[PDB]
Amino acid sequence: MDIILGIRVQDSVILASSKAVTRGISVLKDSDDKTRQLSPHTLMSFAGEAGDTVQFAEYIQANIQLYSIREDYELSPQAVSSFVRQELAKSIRSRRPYQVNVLIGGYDKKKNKPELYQIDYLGTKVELPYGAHGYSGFYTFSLLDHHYRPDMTTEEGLDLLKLCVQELEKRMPMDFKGVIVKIVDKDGIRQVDDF
Amino acid sequence: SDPSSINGGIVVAMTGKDCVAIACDLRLGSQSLGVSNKFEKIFHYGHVFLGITGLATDVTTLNEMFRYKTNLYKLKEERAIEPETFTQLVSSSLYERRFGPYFVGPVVAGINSKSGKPFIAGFDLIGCIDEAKDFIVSGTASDQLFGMCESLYEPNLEPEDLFETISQALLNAADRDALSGWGAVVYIIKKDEVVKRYLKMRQD
């Protein structure tokens, strides 16, 4: 767990998440998918403490899927993000808090708009055009401040994302073994296999 | 961060009938990482033999220091230093660094050329002399060596028998210590001949 990025463009949300799982002085895995599909049009990436990350992600996934079955209806990205925030807001004052930071990328079918939410382990939620967790932000935010435009296409967003990964691969101390990129839009969630 | 157990290693010395034996392992490591399997811990100045365990930099430094001091001794005295005299020199030199000591466990071994008496001795890091009739042990597997020697040893062993006893003491002690082993050397010392034997032991 280290690098998770998110970029909201005109018609989609793009999440990029590093593939490395490192422990001590050993990269145990270089093909890890740090994300779970909460619903057909909502995707959550995650990063933080070992064990906590997946345990939390799957717990949220289970709850959202339970809701979908019960009501035969998909929750909006705003609704899901609020549910997630509250779970983390409870967690931070527990005996042992979930040390997990997440990005929630979704496409609201009622509004026909992409939405990106950034939530930290404290339960701090913000809606953003682009987001990042951990040390990634210290490079990508300034870069996106410069190159990002609100009316960009998905293809323009992927090029913008390539520019971030290149910068991180140049200046980051650790080898994060590239990223898995996923796109969330009106047609649902799909993975870019060649990045 | 315990200087005496960073590099690891062991030395053991025994007396026999008109002979002495001194033996050491060959491991030099950095905690868990084994680095070198050729690091000998026994040196000699004339007919006097010195084994040193502990922090490897100090082992090397002290060898160079006692080579220095025994060379000057020989030039001025016009004779080779004896084990009893060398033992005192080691003790003096270590206690000189009382409040900033060399992190070592030295072991002197040899035969006095005048009297012919077998001699062995041990020291703590600040130079306290531990003289013994039977055996001296040193290193990260000192507990193991004490147990092996105290049970296996018997007085007045012949050079060929003494070799088997000291070798088995070292080998079985080293195999119960993580930081010791990786090969071993045994010196058999008679009045005017010295035989050096490398032992075959498990390499883990």
């Binding site: - | 306290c128 531990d130 001949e193 035989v195 075959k200």
Partner: protein
């Protein structure tokens, strides 16, 4: 360690056990804790082994030079003064706990010194880990006007209490008798009540048991 000192009619006697420890391990089963400062001034030492040996040799060296300078036999109070001032200067870091005794032109004397440089005077004293076991015996059996043979018996009994009851002490009993008008007699291994019993088996190996890789003759000659 267990060490003691006992005054008698015409002099003083000191004694000590012969165990040297390294944590819970017995390093030396027969070490000498009785030290000669001068011919008729002897010292029993407890505490840090190197320190007791070093401090006693240094003061013993200076006492010899002093004795030659002054053309006089050295006095116990001189050794006492030189030891305490040395130990005090090092604020207890030199861990030497000593029982200083001897005879000189002034008479017979018995003192103790602690690592921090405090000295004490007495007719009977005990230092070391087994001092309480020894002092219990001394307090129970000591009396004024002891003879030579009575003092040796009392001293060795006090050491034995330490040997048996204190885990820090063991093996043998060393004794040194310093009588006025006579040479001091050092009785190395005066008692040996801890002899190792015969082993059940000989562990002499058949020749060729140990696997060898290489042989070579070592050159010790020029």
């Amino acid at each position: 360690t267990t060490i003691v000192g006992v005054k008698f009619n015409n002099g003083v006697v000191i004694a000590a056990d012969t165990r040297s420890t390294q944590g819970p391990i017995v390093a030396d089963k027969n070490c000498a804790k009785l030290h000669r400062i001068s011919p008729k001034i002897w010292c029993a030492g407890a505490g840090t082994a190197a320190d007791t040996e070093a401090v006693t040799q240094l003061i013993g060296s200076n006492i010899e030079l002093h004795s030659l300078y002054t053309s006089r036999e050295p006095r116990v109070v001189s050794a006492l003064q030189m030891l305490k001032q040395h130990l005090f200067k090092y604020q207890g870091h030199i861990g030497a706990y000593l029982i200083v005794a001897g005879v000189d032109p002034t008479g017979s004397h018995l003192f103790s010194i602690h690592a921090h440089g405090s000295t004490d005077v007495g007719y009977y004293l005990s230092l070391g880990s087994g001092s309480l076991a020894a002092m219990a015996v001394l307090e129970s059996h000591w009396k004024q006007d002891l003879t030579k043979e009575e003092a040796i018996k009392l001293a060795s009994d006090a050491i034995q209490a330490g040997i048996w009851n204190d885990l820090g002490s063991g093996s043998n009993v060393d004794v040194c008798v310093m009588e006025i008008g006579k040479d001091a007699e050092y009785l190395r291994n005066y008692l040996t009540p801890n002899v190792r019993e015969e082993k059940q088996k000989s562990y002499k190996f058949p020749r060729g048991t140990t696997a060898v890789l290489k042989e070579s003759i070592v050159n010790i000659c020029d």
